[PDB]
Amino acid sequence: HHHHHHMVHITLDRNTANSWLIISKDRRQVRMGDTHQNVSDNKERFSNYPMVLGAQRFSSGKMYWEVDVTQKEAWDLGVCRDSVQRKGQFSLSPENGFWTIWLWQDSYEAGTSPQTTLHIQVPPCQIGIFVDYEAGVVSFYNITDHGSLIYTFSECVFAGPLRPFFNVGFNYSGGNAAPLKLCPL
């Protein structure tokens, strides 16, 4: 692709994080902690899942960023409305305000309703995410495979400001402790 020039510097918003997440000092990395991380509760925190938002809000334009997923077994990545549900159980779908892909149990899927199988020959170590607000597009790229397209959501109905969205996944297996990292420009 040729979207690299729309690169934006994303940082994570501590206040939105599930209470078990550990965000690095530079706000560029997140991982699952062993326990509650000793923060107060608030209405912004995702309660049921190991999720966190970027601080940046987008309402126009073209935006691109990259995320490192090296050695993880499970994660969700994409964008979401600023007003997504934070508490209780919910599915990742455009109806609920999410435009995401994920890895789970050795397969990749797009967060449509129902979910869509992805065809990836080279397991990615870094994912590129492109948002065109005006066009209603969210696209995902395999940086490990020379930028090959993974998935395009088109005809998106954002219906609000967008925020970068992250889920580090649970670590029941002991194989999913590695962080998500925002990669440098």
Ligand X SMILES: COC1CN(S(=O)(=O)N2CCCC2)C1
- Give 100-123 as a DSSP string: EEEEETTEEEE--SS-EE---SS-
Which residues contribute to the site for ligand X (CB under 6 A)? 32, 34, 170-172, 177
135 Cβ contact partners less than 8 Å away, ≥ 6 residues apart: 154
Q: How far is the CB of 151 from ligand X (least distance, A)?
A: 27
- Residue closer to ligand X by CB (options 104, 170) is 170
- Residue closer to ligand X by CB (options 34, 41) is 34
- Residue closer to ligand X by CB (options 75, 130) is 75
HSE (side-chain half, CA atoms, 13 Å) at 49: 19
Q: How far is the CB of 171 from ligand X (least distance, A)?
A: 3
Q: How far is the CB of 121 from ligand X (least distance, A)?
A: 30
Give dist(CA 91, CA 96) in Å, integer.
7
Percent helix, strand and coil across the chain, each to the nearest 5: 5, 35, 60
**Pick from 153, 132, 10: nearest CA to 60:** 132
Place of tokens 């918003």: 13
Q: How far is the CB of 19 from ligand X (least distance, A)?
A: 11
- Residue closer to ligand X by CB (options 131, 178) is 178
Q: How far is the CB of 104 from ligand X (least distance, A)?
A: 14
Name the residue whose CB lies closest to ligand X: 171
- Residue closer to ligand X by CB (options 29, 112) is 29
